[PDB]
Amino acid sequence: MSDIRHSLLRRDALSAAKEVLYHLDIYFSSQLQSADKGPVELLEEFVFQVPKERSAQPKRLNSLQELQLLEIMCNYFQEQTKDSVRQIIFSSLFSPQGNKADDSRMSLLGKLVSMAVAVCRIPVLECAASWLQRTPVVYCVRLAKALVDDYCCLVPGSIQTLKQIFSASPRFCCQFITSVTALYDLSSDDLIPPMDLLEMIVTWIFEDPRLILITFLNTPIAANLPIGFLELTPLVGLIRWCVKAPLAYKRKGVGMDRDSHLLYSKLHLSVLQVLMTLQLHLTEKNLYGRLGLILFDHMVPLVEEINRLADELNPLNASQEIELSLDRLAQALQVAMASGALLCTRDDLRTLCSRLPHNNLLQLVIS
Amino acid sequence: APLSAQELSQEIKAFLTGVDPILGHQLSAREHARCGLLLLRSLPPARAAVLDHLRGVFDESVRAHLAALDETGPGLEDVVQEVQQVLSEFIRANPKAWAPVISAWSIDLMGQLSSTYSGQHQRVGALNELLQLWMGCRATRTLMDIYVQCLSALIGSCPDACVDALLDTSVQHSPHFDWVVAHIGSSFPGTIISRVLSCGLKDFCVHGKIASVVGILGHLASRHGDSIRRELLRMFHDSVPFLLQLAVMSPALLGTVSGELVDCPAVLSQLQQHLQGFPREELDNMLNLAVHLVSQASGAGAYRLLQFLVDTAMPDTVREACDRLIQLLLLHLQKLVHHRGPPPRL
Amino acid sequence: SSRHLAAFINKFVQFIHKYITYNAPAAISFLQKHADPLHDLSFDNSDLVMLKSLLAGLLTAAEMAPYMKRLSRGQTVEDLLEVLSD
């Protein structure tokens, strides 16, 4: 009834919102076996500090009452002990509902997820990872980039906390790797990975093949989702990032970032273990179906992006870097062909090499 | 000294419920501030609570400190010094990430308390004396210090937005805000005086208090920094009777008049001729302001000013206006000298 | 024993004000090069308001008028004597 809503439409730290959420979750759990948009939208708007009326004042702003409500929600979610209920609540909270505070609601949901990760709410973190899997790559990747920018830029320890969570949660680690690859698209200066985030990623490359395998084995994959439902294998991003070592200097004075080549190369070297693990998981086992691995015909887009982005004085200043990047790309293509990740035959990338700088690695890739 | 997840939850329950969950007793202000600092060392999406907590703690700190000062809670000197150290550490780590939100939040509460507390306590131009009164307290001093660090970090990036936010907050919290902007103008002349003159001319545009605020700010900013004010006023004049109004309000503008005597050839005569389309009432106000300025405040080598004025009376409409102005000036001086009769005038 | 030389220190800070007025950078260079003795003097002697204010930051006819009135309109030797002693 609307009387309960009115009784829950007062104060920004009110426990009535938590009681309403618990009752709705219990109703959903009771009816799940025999299985509303409006109630979830209203609950999110109440959390987002936007009132029930579409054009009324904000629901009591934020202040310390919003922090109290967030703490109460985190405490309830950690002790919720219901994967489906937590996943449904997380999906409802961070979905674009068209309200005036939709982006702020998504940002607050990401903030709560970061708080849960800091609180080591492992079941809640897993539910958030599943919700991100059930969310568009654009909004989820933007939220991940915002959370990474918030944490990594602070004092040391946030990278340590992220690495510890990645060691604990492998699905969250794979989602974070995919989100980092999507953010570090080599598109601009901001696309250059930050030092702390890159250090955490490089340090967390001991179980990256294991995390990728865990993400692959977590759930069978359907057809291509809408713009990517958190694809596990972000191999193209890592391969480009290794290639984009001189791109840090190219995008920028000019020589602002040039020492990251070795760390990226070390992180890229983990793909050999990932390639062998993927080969064992697909070719050796019965998982040799579909396209081998997550390719999505992105190899041609990757080659086109490499050709387009490398135009910044490739001839003499970055000749050695271009040749090394060509060798890395050839190694990635050979790994994909041997491991079966790229089911397509030749000329899919050999023709693309025509619009790339000539190197001995190009002949080696052709050979 | 890292904090564990359960310890972070306990600190949340401590500063948020007020009671530490184990001991079962309410915490004090010092415990509240130290818990806030502990939370500041952790999750930035949890730092909005840190921001409002610092706002409340600093409100209590300002209340206690200034109550003790005027009567001439417990001391908070060392915790405030540690807060100052940690914010300097942040702004040294990475200005772009912390600086805008912290500057806006600080300026926000800095104006809030200026609007609320000022002019209402026991004993609270006199603007600089008031500035000494706030510098008697230490919390607001440290806040101004870290804000100065913010601007020194924000000089090459976007100081315009910072000064825009500053002057807008001053507009909301006038005239009790203006000691902060007076101190920063003393610290930073150029942008501050440019915004002061823009605010003054737009205030004349409005009225054609706030103008008094602009004049008081100019007076408080002319402590060995009035040369830039004179140059800025000259640049504005090159393009405006708000300058005359401010000089009528602020006698220290007569220092600029000494150079303005040499500033105005026939180019200046034509420039005055262009502005001559103003109406008779505006012209009457202008001549009254001119005689009051040249009489009541010209305490410099104004024999040069008089010589130039008489030389103009020796272009054509300019000369007619100038000899008329000379006659009114003589009448005004006669009114000044022969009157009131017993202290004298000056 | 700095408290008997208040007028001497007043002349000193008048010199300091004129120094910063005409040659600001030289005064800044001198003070910053020897900042430790200046801050030591500021801390040791809390009575020095002017030094702290200086380091942080960077009469008339109205009173004499009755006296020159009495002097000008003074005919008896007593009036001249009293106004001149004043």
What is the Cα–Cα distance from A145 to A183, expressed in whole angstroms? 7
Subunits next to B (3 or more Cβ pairs <8 Å) are A, C
Question: Contact A23/A30 with Cβ under 8 angstroms?
Answer: no
- Determine the residue type at A115: M
| DSSP codes joined into one string, A188-204 | SSTTSPPHHHHHHHHHT
Which residues in chain A are immediately followed by a break of C to N over 2.5 Å?
35, 252
What Å resolution does this PDB entry report? 4.1
CB contact under 8 A, A111 and B42: no
CB contact under 8 A, A67 and B48: yes
A231's CB contacts (< 8 A; 6+ apart) are A178, A294, A296
Q: Is B156 helix (H, G, I), strand (E, B) or coil?
A: coil
Q: Which two tokens stand for residue B60?
A: 């209590």
Residue carrying the six token digits 């999110």: A44
Question: How many other C-beta atoms are found inside a 10 Å radius of the C-beta of residue B110?
Answer: 20
Question: Contact A27/A88 with Cβ under 8 angstroms?
Answer: no
Q: Which two tokens stand for residue C74?
A: 């003074």
Q: How would you label A99-109 residue by residue, b for 16+ Cβ within 10 Å and e otherwise?
A: bebbeebbbbb
User: Cα B319 to the chain's mean position, in Å?
Assistant: 40
Question: Contact A128/A112 with Cβ under 8 angstroms?
Answer: no
What is the Cα–Cα distance from A330 to B191, expressed in whole angstroms? 56
- Determine the residue type at C47: D
Residue carrying the six token digits 């070592």: A245
Q: Which two tokens stand for residue B67?
A: 């109550």
What is the Cα–Cα distance from A194 to A174, expressed in whole angstroms? 18
Q: Which two tokens stand for residue A307?
A: 């050709």
What is the Cα–Cα distance from C54 to B31, expressed in whole angstroms? 38
User: Cα B25 to the chain's mean position, in Å?
Assistant: 45
What is the Cα–Cα distance from A348 to A336, expressed in whole angstroms? 13
Q: Does B32 touch chain A (CB under 8 A)?
A: no
What is the Cα–Cα distance from A174 to A212, expressed in whole angstroms? 6
Note the helical H segments in chain A.
2-7, 16-32, 37-47, 63-78, 83-93, 102-118, 122-133, 137-152, 158-168, 170-183, 195-203, 208-218, 235-243, 247-251, 261-268, 270-279, 299-309, 319-339, 360-366
B323 vs A18, B287, B288, B298, B314, CA distance in Å? Answer: 82, 12, 14, 19, 9
What is the Cα–Cα distance from A244 to A219, expressed in whole angstroms? 32
B237 vs B216, B278, B343, CA distance in Å? Answer: 20, 16, 38
- Burial of residue A322, with CB atoms counted within 10 A of its CB: 0-12 exposed, 13-18 middle, 19 or more buried: buried
Residue B26: beta bridge partners? B19
Residue A349: which of A319, A289, A305 has the closest Cα? A305
B52 vs A31, A291, B75, C60, CA distance in Å? Answer: 42, 53, 21, 53
CB pairs under 8 A between B and C: 15
Q: Which two tokens stand for residue B239?
A: 């393009």
CB contact under 8 A, A151 and B44: yes
End-to-end CA gap in chain A = 72
- Determine the residue type at A219: T
Radius of gyration in angstroms for the set of CA atoms belonging to chain C, rounded to a whole number: 21
Residue A238: which of A302, A194, A307 has the closest Cα? A302
The C-alpha of B45 sits at a distance from chain A's nearest C-alpha, in angstroms, of 5
Residue A348: which of A358, A336, A339 has the closest Cα? A336
Q: Which two tokens stand for residue B271?
A: 């420039």
Q: How would you label B196-232 residue by residue, b for 16+ Cβ within 10 Å and e otherwise?
A: bbebbbebbeeeeebbebbbbbbbbbbeebbeebbeb
Residue A48 DSSP one-character state? T
Q: Which two tokens stand for residue B259?
A: 């150079």
Residues B334-339: contacts with CB under 8 Å, at least 24 apart: B336/B295, B336/B296
Angle at A168 between CA A167 and CA A174, to 5 degrees: 65
What is the Cα–Cα distance from A232 to A345, expressed in whole angstroms? 23
What is the Cα–Cα distance from A314 to A308, expressed in whole angstroms? 11
Angle at A24 between CA A18 and CA A29, to 5 degrees: 125
Question: Contact A136/A230 with Cβ under 8 angstroms?
Answer: no
CB contact under 8 A, B343 and C65: yes
User: Cα B34 to the chain's mean position, in Å?
Assistant: 33
Question: Contact A134/A91 with Cβ under 8 angstroms?
Answer: yes
B279 vs A98, B250, B271, B283, B288, CA distance in Å? Answer: 56, 25, 17, 6, 14
Check residue A65 and give left, alpha or beta (phi > 0: left; psi -120 to 50: alpha).
alpha
Residue of C nearest to B344 (CA): C62
- Burial of residue A133, with CB atoms counted within 10 A of its CB: 0-12 exposed, 13-18 middle, 19 or more buried: buried
What is the Cα–Cα distance from A309 to A191, expressed in whole angstroms? 12
Q: Does A360 touch chain B (CB under 8 A)?
A: no
What is the Cα–Cα distance from B290 to B294, expressed in whole angstroms? 6
The C-alpha of A244 sits at a distance from chain B's nearest C-alpha, in angstroms, of 25
Q: Which two tokens stand for residue A265?
A: 């190369």
Enclosing H/E stretch for B278: none
Question: Contact A201/A241 with Cβ under 8 angstroms?
Answer: no
Question: Contact B169/B113 with Cβ under 8 angstroms?
Answer: no
Which residue among C21, C62, C65 places its CB closest to the CB of B224?
A: C21
What is the Cα–Cα distance from C70 to C77, expressed in whole angstroms? 12
- Determine the residue type at A190: D
Q: Is B26 helix (H, G, I), strand (E, B) or coil?
A: strand
Q: Does A68 touch chain B (CB under 8 A)?
A: yes
Question: Contact B28/B66 with Cβ under 8 angstroms?
Answer: no
Question: Contact B220/B125 with Cβ under 8 angstroms?
Answer: yes
> The dihedral of CA B164, B168, B174, B176: what is its sign?
negative
Return residues 7-46 of C near B (CB < 8 Å): 20-21, 24
Which residue among A63, A110, A115 places its CB closest to the CB of B46?
A: A115
The C-alpha of A222 sits at a distance from chain B's nearest C-alpha, in angstroms, of 35
**Looking at beta carbons, which residues of chain A come within 8 Å of B42?**
118
Q: Pick the residue of B6, B9, B96, B101 with the most A CBs within 10 A to test the interface with A by mutation.
A: B9
Q: Is B52 helix (H, G, I), strand (E, B) or coil?
A: helix
Residue A112: which of A76, A164, A74, A157 has the closest Cα? A74
Q: Does C59 touch chain B (CB under 8 A)?
A: no
Residue of C nearest to B221 (CA): C57
Residue carrying the six token digits 């906390």: A161
What is the Cα–Cα distance from B128 to A297, expressed in whole angstroms? 71
Residue B19: beta bridge partners? B26
Max intra-chain CA distance, chain A: 75
What is the Cα–Cα distance from A85 to A170, expressed in whole angstroms? 21
Residue carrying the six token digits 């009448």: B331
- Burial of residue A123, with CB atoms counted within 10 A of its CB: 0-12 exposed, 13-18 middle, 19 or more buried: middle
**Looking at beta carbons, which residues of chain C come within 8 Å of B186?**
57
Residue A314 DSSP one-character state? T
Subunits next to A (3 or more Cβ pairs <8 Å) are B
| DSSP codes joined into one string, B210-255 | HHHHHHHHHHHH-TTTHHHHHHHHHHHHH--THHHHHHHH-GGGHH
| DSSP codes joined into one string, A94-127 | TS----TTHHHHHHHHHHHHHHHHHTT-HHHHHH
Question: How many other C-beta atoms are found inside a 10 Å radius of the C-beta of residue A37?
Answer: 9
B140's CB contacts (< 8 A; 6+ apart) are B62, B110, B134
Q: Pick the residue of C16, C46, C58 with the most B CBs within 10 A to test the interface with B by mutation.
A: C58
Question: Contact A312/A250 with Cβ under 8 angstroms?
Answer: yes
Question: Contact B224/C21 with Cβ under 8 angstroms?
Answer: yes
Q: Is B19 helix (H, G, I), strand (E, B) or coil?
A: strand
Residues A182-186: contacts with CB under 8 Å, at least 24 apart: A182/A137, A182/A141, A182/A228, A182/A234, A182/A237, A183/A141, A183/A144, A183/A145, A183/A148, A184/A237, A184/A241, A185/A237, A185/A240, A186/A240, A186/A241, A186/A243, A186/A244, A186/A247, A186/A305, A186/A309
The C-alpha of B78 sits at a distance from chain A's nearest C-alpha, in angstroms, of 22
Question: Contact A239/A147 with Cβ under 8 angstroms?
Answer: no
- Determine the residue type at A14: L
Residue carrying the six token digits 């300002």: B62
Residue B1: which of B53, B37, B50 has the closest Cα? B37
